[PDB]
């Protein structure tokens, strides 16, 4: 009861945050090849003029303005590039 | 780890070689592939060799 006892912990591990999430939001004007959203799995899908990379990163394939819309029978979320 | 490293040398006589990893024990048979050879700019047979 003098000083203290002791006892190690088994946790204290974690990983570098990956900076996911929407980079360019709706209404923004992107250059071709701009990343619109980095994500894990197609949480967002590739609409018009939008390409999906291997890590499911959505990048604009044409110059223009971003546009999110709920589309399809599963009410999924599609990112499209309106021509500008 | 358990996989060793091998180089696939060109059979076109360029001396060019790709490199890759192979499981020696489970696939003892050598590995042959048609891979592009930049030196002769043609797809040619590449066969396995030690690194």
């Amino acid at each position: 009861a003098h000083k203290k006892a002791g006892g190690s912990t088994r946790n204290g591990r974690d990983s570098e945050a990956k900076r996911l999430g929407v980079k360019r939001f709706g209404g923004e004007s992107v250059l071709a090849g701009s990343i619109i959203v980095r994500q894990r799995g197609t949480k967002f899908h590739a609409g018009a003029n939008v390409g999906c990379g291997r890590d499911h990163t959505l990048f604009a394939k044409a110059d223009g303005k971003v546009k999110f819309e709920v589309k399809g029978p599963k009410n999924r979320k599609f990112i499209s590039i309106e021509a500008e | 780890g358990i996989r060793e490293k091998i180089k696939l040398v060109s059979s076109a006589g360029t001396g060019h070689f790709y490199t890759t990893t192979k499981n020696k024990r489970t696939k003892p048979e050598k590995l042959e592939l048609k891979k592009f050879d930049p030196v002769v700019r043609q797809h040619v047979i590449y066969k396995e060799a030690k690194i």
Binding site: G6, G7, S8, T9, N11 | -
Partner: protein
């Protein structure tokens, strides 16, 4: 320090209005006495409520 502690007891956070104990099949006055006896063992102010249609 040196980590978290060990679990010692389990509680149930109580917010005002939560109906803790319910009772049926007894007279109202005896229910009041029983609930008084029970509330005497709890660290929260209580009150006696009845059933209503809505």
């Amino acid at each position: 320090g040196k980590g978290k502690g060990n679990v010692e007891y389990w509680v149930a956070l109580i917010q005002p209005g939560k109906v803790l104990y319910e009772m049926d099949g007894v007279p109202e006055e005896l229910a009041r006495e029983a609930f008084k006896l029970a509330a005497a063992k709890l660290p929260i102010k209580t009150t006696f409520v009845t059933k209503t249609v809505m």
